[PDB]
């Protein structure tokens, strides 16, 4: 339910290195880290925007 096409086709960069070891599980800043490392994703992205039926 989102038209952008930037889900799992990029996530592997700061999510699998920042959203898998850093502080993504911690709801302290979330959208405040959006651009510095982990960010406030938590979804990791897996074909949810680029394809609603992926």
Distinct helix (H) and strand (E) counts, the chain: 0, 0
Nearest residue to 16 via CA among 52, 43, 54, 53: 43
Quote the tokens at residue 53.
Answer: 């039926």
Rounded alpha-carbon distances, angstroms, from residue 5 to 11, 14, 32, 48? 11, 17, 22, 8
Q: Is residue 17 within 8 Å of 41, Cβ to Cβ?
A: no
């Amino acid at each position: 339910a989102q038209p952008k096409c930037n889900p799992n086709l990029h996530y592997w960069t700061t999510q699998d290195e920042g959203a898998a070891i850093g502080l993504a599980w911690i709801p302290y800043f979330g959208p405040a880290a959006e651009g510095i490392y982990i960010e406030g994703l938590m979804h990791n992205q897996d074909g949810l925007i680029c394809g609603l039926r992926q």
